[PDB]
């Protein structure tokens, strides 16, 4: 017997105390070690309602990631609120590790185990856990990287599909690798990401098939982002401490709905901070081969409005509200207070 409630969670992880990597350093002083013997209990004859779009755990993870980045990254110049802060900017070691979110005494986490659960409504296979699974705090736009996969079918998630201003999270059931590289040998900020077009276009085709099921079999068209800042019009992520911006036009090629797809990328030293606080400048990139191989596990999409009059629906790669990144992993959990 319990009741939905919000409370302050703590974090746990397997951070190494001897590592200089900044996530390990943060988690070493802001998280406790993981519990060696996890205690998950299936709750029999128990149905429970979930709502991933009103889940205070999302707000709490966002606060953690903001804190982590604020004490880890070291721009040479920070421009925020009309002021300018200049400081030392050594190169850092950067590579996310899994963070587990845990309830204090008197509370527990309920976990939805229905494999086609869309994030809202009743769940018939519910268990209780003390902590979530390990979630990597990967900050990206357009593509969700290094996350968990849907266990059966591709899942379309939205707080309201009819409202085109609401972001769509596409949860994939097969990961697709994206392999990004700034080579050793020219223009030191020039990079590229390689994706196996065979695997990708197959998944994309399956994604379009799912979208048809929710939009009454209209024609599904992909278009590049309309406009905005580069962090939004590009797939932006952080690889080894460097800020990558990749052009995803060839990833959403309507015609292919087989060879290697090569996306042009650039590392940028001057960025708009995803925390919303302003602009920051970092030092030039490190020497040598900079390489990140990530698994694409989801896609953020925004649907064009005003198209009811037509027979097609147009989708543009989306993102920017990084909270949706955490929502994509926390959708199956909720906190309750034991009574
Ligand atoms: N120029 C406009 C500005 N947009 C941003 O700040 C913004 C959005 C997303 C990112 C971002 C994403 C990913 C990465 C990384 F590389 F790490 F993956 C870096 N940045 N930045 C604002 N308009 C209004 C606002 C409210 O006050 S904020
Ligand atoms: C999710 O499931 C609920 C309950 O079955 C339904 O009301 C809602 O429309 C669904 N959302 C999507 C995006 O399928
Ligand atoms: C992923 O889901 C699609 C339908 O959404 C299904 O046809 C496909 O077989 C699934 N793939 C895997 C590997 O389960
Ligand atoms: C969903 O969005 C449509 C279009 O904006 C709106 O008319 C409707 O009221 C929304 N539904 C809910 C439950 O907010
Ligand atoms: C990633 O791409 C580079 C080429 O830049 C290649 O050397 C490397 O083997 C690739 N890695 C994987 C896992 O495909
Ligand atoms: C992406 O590439 C296409 C074609 O190369 C180009 O027309 C478009 O402007 C690029 N997008 C951005 C945001 O630079
Ligand atoms: C994704 O995970 C791999 C393996 O740990 C890592 O090398 C890569 O840097 C990660 N990608 C991002 C964007 O953090």
Residue 120 β-bridge partners: 51
Range of the domain at 54: 2-338
Could you tell me whether strands 32-33 and 10-13 are parallel, antiparallel, or unpaired per DSSP bridges?
parallel
124 Cα: distance to centroid of ligand 6 (angstroms):
46
Give the 3-state secondary structure of the chain: CEEECCCCCEEEECCCCCCCCHHHHHHHHHCEECCCCCCCEEECCCCEEEECCCCHHHHHHHHHHHHHHHHHCCCCEEEECCEEEECCCCCCCCCCCCEEEECCCCEEEEEECCCCCCCEEEECCEEEECECCCECCCCCCCEEECCCCCCCCCEEECCCCCCCCCCEEEEEEEEEEEEEEECCCCCCCEEEEEEEHHHHHHHHHHHHHHHHHHCCCCEEEECCCCCCCHHHHCEEEEECCEEEEECCHHHHCHHHCCCEEEEEEEEECEEECCCCCCEEECCCCCCCCEEEEEEEEEEEEEECCCCCCCCEEEEEECCCCCHHHHHHHHCCEEEEEEC
User: Count of alpha carbons within 13 Å of 128, Cβ hemisphere only?
Assistant: 15
Mutate to test the pocket of ligand 6, among 141, 191, 192, 224 (most ligand atoms within 8 A of CB): 224
Query: Cα separation of 22 and 96, whole Å?
Result: 8
249 lines ligand 6 (CB under 6 A): yes
Taking a C-beta distance cutoff of 8 angstroms, is the pair 130, 109 a contact? yes
Query: Cα separation of 36 and 100, whole Å?
Result: 13
- Geometric angle at alpha carbon 326, from 246 and 115, rounded to 5°: 105
Query: Cα separation of 308 and 260, whole Å?
Result: 36
The total number of structural domains in the chain stands at 1
Query: Cα separation of 291 and 283, whole Å?
Result: 18
Dihedral sign, Cα of residue 204, residue 205, residue 211, residue 213 = negative
Closest CA to 91 of 145, 32, 21: 21
- State the virtual CA torsion across 142, 314, 230, 243 in degrees, nearest 10: 20
- State the virtual CA torsion across 108, 159, 60, 270 in degrees, nearest 10: 150
Closest CA to 110 of 4, 13, 182: 4
Mutate to test the pocket of ligand 4, among 162, 166, 215, 302 (most ligand atoms within 8 A of CB): 162
The tokens describing 39, both together, are 């205690």
The tokens describing 47, both together, are 């149905």
**Which residue lies with its CA nearest to atom 17 of ligand 1?**
237
**Which residue lies with its CA nearest to atom 4 of ligand 2?**
121
Ligand approaching nearest to the C-alpha of 182: 5
Closest CA to 35 of 110, 109, 132, 137: 132
Taking a C-beta distance cutoff of 8 angstroms, is the pair 316, 301 a contact? yes
**Ligand 4 site: residues with CB under 6 angstroms?**
160, 162-163
118 lines ligand 6 (CB under 6 A): no
Dihedral sign, Cα of residue 286, residue 283, residue 319, residue 260 = negative
The tokens describing 263, both together, are 């996306």
Taking a C-beta distance cutoff of 8 angstroms, is the pair 274, 146 a contact? no
Query: Cα separation of 325 and 139, whole Å?
Result: 7
Distances (CA, A) of 249 to 147, 190, 234, 246: 23, 17, 9, 9
Query: Which method, experimentally, gave rise to this model?
Result: X-ray
Reported resolution in A? 1.9
**Which residue lies with its CA nearest to atom 1 of ligand 7?**
294
Q: Which atom of ligand 6 is closest in space to residue 230's alpha carbon?
A: 13
Taking a C-beta distance cutoff of 8 angstroms, is the pair 84, 230 a contact? no
Taking a C-beta distance cutoff of 8 angstroms, is the pair 333, 55 a contact? yes
> For the purposes of burial, counting CB atoms within 10 Å of the CB of 196, is it exposed (0-12), middle (13-18) or buried (19 or more)?
middle
Q: Phi then psi for 108, rounded to 5 degrees? A: -150, 160
Closest CA to 176 of 142, 203, 141: 203
Tell me the residue length of the chain: 339
Query: Cα separation of 257 and 125, whole Å?
Result: 36
Query: Cα separation of 237 and 230, whole Å?
Result: 12
What region does 117 belong to: left with phi over 0, alpha with psi -120 to 50, or beta?
beta
Look up the CATH number of the domain holding residue 148: 2.170.40.20
- State the virtual CA torsion across 321, 241, 233, 148 in degrees, nearest 10: -50
Query: Cα separation of 119 and 311, whole Å?
Result: 28
253 lines ligand 6 (CB under 6 A): no
Ligand approaching nearest to the C-alpha of 265: 6
The tokens describing 324, both together, are 């949706």
Could you tell me whether strands 279-281 and 77-80 are parallel, antiparallel, or unpaired per DSSP bridges?
antiparallel
């Amino acid at each position: 017997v319990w009741k939905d409630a919000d409370t302050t969670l703590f974090c746990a992880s397997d951070a190494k105390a001897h590592e200089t990597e900044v996530h390990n350093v943060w988690a070493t002083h802001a998280c406790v070690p993981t519990d060696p013997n996890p205690q998950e209990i299936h709750l029999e004859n128990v149905t429970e309602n979930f709502n991933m779009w009103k889940n205070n755990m999302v707000e709490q993870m966002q606060e953690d990631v903001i804190s982590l980045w604020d004490q880890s990254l070291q721009p040479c110049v920070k421009l925020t609120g009309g002021s300018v802060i200049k400081q030392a900017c050594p190169k850092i070691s950067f590579d996310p590790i899994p963070i587990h979110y845990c309830t204090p005494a008197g509370y527990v986490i309920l976990k939805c185990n229905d494999k086609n659960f869309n994030g809202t409504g009743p769940c018939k296979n519910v268990s209780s856990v003390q902590c979530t699974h390990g979630i990597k705090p990967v900050v990206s736009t357009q593509l969700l990287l290094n996350g968990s996969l849907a266990e059966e079918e591709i899942i379309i998630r939205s707080e309201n599909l009819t409202n085109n201003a609401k972001t769509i999270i596409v949860h994939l059931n097969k990961s697709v690798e994206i392999n990004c590289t700034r080579p050793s040998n020219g223009d030191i900020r020039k990079a590229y990401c390689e994706i196996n077009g065979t695997k990708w276009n197959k998944v994309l085709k399956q994604v379009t098939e799912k979208l048809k099921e929710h939009f009454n079999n209209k024609t599904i068209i992909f278009q590049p982002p309309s406009g905005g800042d580069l962090e939004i019009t590009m797939h932006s992520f952080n690889c080894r401490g460097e800020f990558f911006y990749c052009n995803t036009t060839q990833l959403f090629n309507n015609t292919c709905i087989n060879g290697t797809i090569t996306l042009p990328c650039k590392i940028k030293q001057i960025i708009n901070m995803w925390q919303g606080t302003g602009q920051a400048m970092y030092a030039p990139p490190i020497d040598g081969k900079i390489n990140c191989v990530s698994n694409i596990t989801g896609i953020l999409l925004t649907r064009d409005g005003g198209a009811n009059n037509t027979s097609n629906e147009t989708f543009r790669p989306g993102g920017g509200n990084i909270k949706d990144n955490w929502r994509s992993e926390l959708y199956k959990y909720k906190v309750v207070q034991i009574e």
